[PDB]
Amino acid sequence: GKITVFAAASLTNAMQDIATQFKKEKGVDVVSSFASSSTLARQIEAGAPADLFISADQKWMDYAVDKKAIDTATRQTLLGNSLVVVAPKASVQKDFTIDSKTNWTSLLNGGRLAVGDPEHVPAGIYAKEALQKLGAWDTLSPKLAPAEDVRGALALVERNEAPLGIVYGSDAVASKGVKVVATFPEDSHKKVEYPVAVVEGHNNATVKAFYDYLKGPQAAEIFKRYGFTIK
Amino acid sequence: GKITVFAAASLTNAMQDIATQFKKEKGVDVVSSFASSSTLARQIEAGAPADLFISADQKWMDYAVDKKAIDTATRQTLLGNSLVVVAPKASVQKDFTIDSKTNWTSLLNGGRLAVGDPEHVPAGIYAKEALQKLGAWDTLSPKLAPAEDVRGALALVERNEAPLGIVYGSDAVASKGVKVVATFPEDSHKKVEYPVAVVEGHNNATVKAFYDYLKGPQAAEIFKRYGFTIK
């Protein structure tokens, strides 16, 4: 011990497994906190004891940097992802295509579309950008079930509280209880990218060892298993 | 709706604002895709649904034309630009002069120079031509941080991943987080020029209306605001 990592909710499973393997191999305890990248960046700005931050978008890393909270010499883009629509496996929902013709109203059946809160959650921000580009936003905005992070959105679908949800490709890979039923075209939104950086003043030898591990082959194997792409 | 525009990454902000104003005034949706002009030209060759193409160089328009993908009767040079070196505003980098005496090695501090990939990105091609003419290319080529388009190069500097980058003058105008620290002499490279053309078979009345709008005073004011010169 002891390293404290703040990581985007979509990284929950990968980062837990990486922490477990790092403990086994290096004997260092890694304690992780998972929430929306917005929530995490704001906590770091306000003074949280995080050593490392991984965001699900460039936006919230840029925010933390602008607040002079990050060791910028350590910043780099670590992972990529896709944006998808999921439905429960028990659902009868057939696979559909996402484009400007998509009939969201018909697909929703009077139900709501689970999303990360588009006011701040990266998954919601990516979703809103895509839906605006596709001309679907005004139709969908009153039909949303916003959640506090992308895993809250995933949970609404897992729990059948919303028939469809917008989450990351990796979220479907991690979930026994939902399946991808549509994938957003990559040209419909900003590339989903995960920057990592050490928090300003926290780059000691132990933190550096874990940072390096995140860029190594053991971690890469785990990230790929969970549906992330390696930058 | 609906017009599809493929435009050089350097046109991102200008073309977004032009699309917004055109929608307001004409009620037509303009959907834009931004990437390196190389990437866009090759997508059009392979069969993309683009109606209009604006390249950041003559080279990639000539390429698209050679592949018989363009309505050549509509081709013309729309804009000009400059080539610059940017640094973050938080950098202590002083302004310098670009000529054959420039000490790039000293300026870089062991860091890398962000550029559009000089194998295909127009900003990289212009950069390589200038650096070769100035006698700096052999020194700099192993010190580059290539990016997939000029906005990727700009992002490396904005994010402090590279201390300096070669981008267009317009890119500095669009970016809160970098400033120009040197300007390439105009005689060091081919004039930065942006040709526009309608894609072969796509010149319907709606596309023609937007094409004409790009040559009008409303668009010209936006292009100038973003640092472009009007041809």
Which chain A residues contact residue B33 at CB under 8 A? 187
To the nearest whole Å, the CA of B115 is away from the closest chain A CA by: 17
Tokens of B10: 């350097």
Q: In this structure, are residues B2 and A100 in contact, taking their beta carbons and an 8 Å threshold? A: yes
What are the two backbone dihedrals, phi and then psi, of residue A109, each rounded to the nearest 5 degrees? 55, 35
Please indicate if the annotation marks B65 as binding a ligand: no
Which letter does DSSP use for residue B34 in this model? E
Q: With beta carbons less than 8 A apart as the criterion, state whether A162 and A113 touch.
A: yes
Tokens encoding B115: 């550029």
Q: Which helix (DSSP H) or strand (DSSP E) does residue A213 occupy?
A: helix A205-214
**B187 burial type by CB count under 10 A (0-12 exposed, 13-18 middle, 19+ buried):** exposed
For residue A134, what is the DSSP state? T
Task: Report chain B residues whose CB lies below 8 A from the CB of A76.
Answer: 161
Q: Quick one: which of A155, A199, A181, A184 has its CA closest to A47?
A: A199
What residues of chain A lie within 8 A of the CB of B2, using their CB? 100
Collect all residues of chain A within an 8 Å Cβ-Cβ radius of residue B155. 58
CB–CB of A11/A194 below 8 Å?
A: yes
Question: What does DSSP say about strands B192-198 and B76-81: parallel, antiparallel, or unpaired?
Answer: antiparallel
Q: How far apart are CA B72 and CA A94, in angstroms?
A: 44
- Specify the residue for token string 């591990």: A213
| The domain over range B1-80+193-231 is classified in CATH as 3.30.420.40 | no
B81-192 has CATH 3.40.190.10 classification: yes
Q: Measuring CA to CA, how many Å separate B119 from each of B125, B132, B141? A: 7, 14, 12
Which of A62, A133, A195 lies at the smallest CB-CB distance from B31?
A: A133
The reply to whether residue B2 touches residue A100, judged by beta carbons under 8 angstroms, is: yes
Give me the amino acid identity at A84: V
* Cα B142 from Cα B104, distance rounded (Å): 12
Residue A152: CB atoms within 10 Å: 22
Asked if residues B230 and B224 have their Cβ atoms less than 8 Å apart, the reply is yes
User: Does residue B65 contact residue B72 with C-beta atoms inside 8 Å?
Assistant: yes
The upper half-sphere exposure of residue B210, i.e. CA atoms within 13 Å in the direction of its Cβ, equals 31
User: Taking CB atoms and an 8 Å cutoff, what residues of chain A touch B5?
Assistant: none
| Helices of type H across chain B | 12-26, 37-46, 58-66, 104-108, 122-134, 137-140, 150-158, 169-174, 205-214, 217-225
d(CA B49, CA B61): 17
- Give, in order, the Cα–Cα distances in Å from B54 to each of A141, B212, B215: 33, 14, 12
Sequence-distant (≥ 6) Cβ neighbours of residue A23 within 8 angstroms: A29, A30
Distance, CA of A225 to CA of A14 (rounded, Å): 8
d(CA B231, CA B226): 15
Edge-first strand order for the sheet with B113-116 is B144-147, B113-116, B164-168, B83-88, B178-183
Question: How far does Cα B84 stand from its chain's mean position?
Answer: 12
Phi and psi, residue B180, nearest 5°:
-70, 130
Among chain A residues, CA nearest to B16? A133
Residues A165, A115 contacting (CB under 8 angstroms) = yes
Distance CA B137, CA B160 (A): 23
Structure tokens at B119: 């194998």
Helix or strand or coil: residue B174? helix
Give the residue from A52, A38, A30 showing the smallest Cα distance to A10: A38
Reference B157, options B114, B125, B122; nearest CA is B114
Q: Does the distance separating the beta carbons of B160 and A65 come in below 8 Å?
A: yes
d(CA B152, CA B76): 27
Q: What is the 3-state secondary structure (H, E, C) of A166-196?
A: EEEHHHHHHCCCEEEEEECCHHHCCCEEEEE
Q: How many CB atoms lie within 10 A of CB A47?
A: 8
Helix (H) or strand (E) segment spanning residue A223: helix A217-225
**Which residue carries 């070196």 as its tokens?**
B85
Contact A209, A198 (CB under 8 A): no
Inter-residue contact A108 to A143 (CB < 8 Å):
yes
Answer whether A73 sits within 8 Å of B159, measured CB to CB: no
Tell me if B161 and A76 make a contact (CB, 8 A cut-off): yes
Q: Which residues contact B27 (CB under 8 A, 6 or more apart)?
A: none
C-alpha–C-alpha distance, residues B62 and B75, integer Å: 10
Q: Which residue of A has its CA nearest to B48?
A: A187
Angle between helices B37-46 and B58-66 (to 10 degrees): 10
Rounded Cα gap, residues B11 and B119, in angstroms: 20
Sequence-distant (6+) residues with CB within 8 A of B134 are: B98, B99, B100, B102, B188
* Cross-chain CB nearest to A72 (options B31, B33, B160): B160
Report the length, in residues, of chain A: 231
Residue of A nearest to B30 (CA): A133
| Interatomic CA distance for residues B9 and A37, integer angstroms | 27
**DSSP reduced 3-state for B76:** strand
Compute the distance between CA of residue A7 and CA of residue A72 in angstroms, rounded to an integer.
17
> d(Cα A76, Cα B11) in Å, to the nearest integer?
25
CB A154 within 8 A of CB A160: no
Domain boundaries along the sequence of chain A: 1-80+193-231, 81-192
What is residue A156's three-state secondary structure? helix
B47's CB contacts (< 8 A; 6+ apart) are none
- Nearest chain B residue to A135, by CA: B29
Q: Are A1-80+193-231 and A81-192 the same fold in CATH?
A: yes
Contacts of A218 (CB under 8 A, 6+ apart): A18, A21, A25
A52-54 and A3-8 as β-strands: parallel, antiparallel, unpaired?
parallel
C-alpha A128/C-alpha B147 separation (Å) is 26
Please note each residue after which chain B is broken, C-to-N distance over 2.5 A, or write none: none
Resolution in Å, one decimal place: 1.4
User: What approach was used to elucidate this structure?
Assistant: X-ray
CB count within 10 Å of CB B138 equals 9
Please state the φ and ψ torsions of residue B171, each to the nearest 5 degrees: -65, -35
Query: Which 3-state string (H, E, C) describes A68-81?
Result: CCECHHHCEEEEEE
Q: Which pair of structure tokens corresponds to residue A192?
A: 């989903």
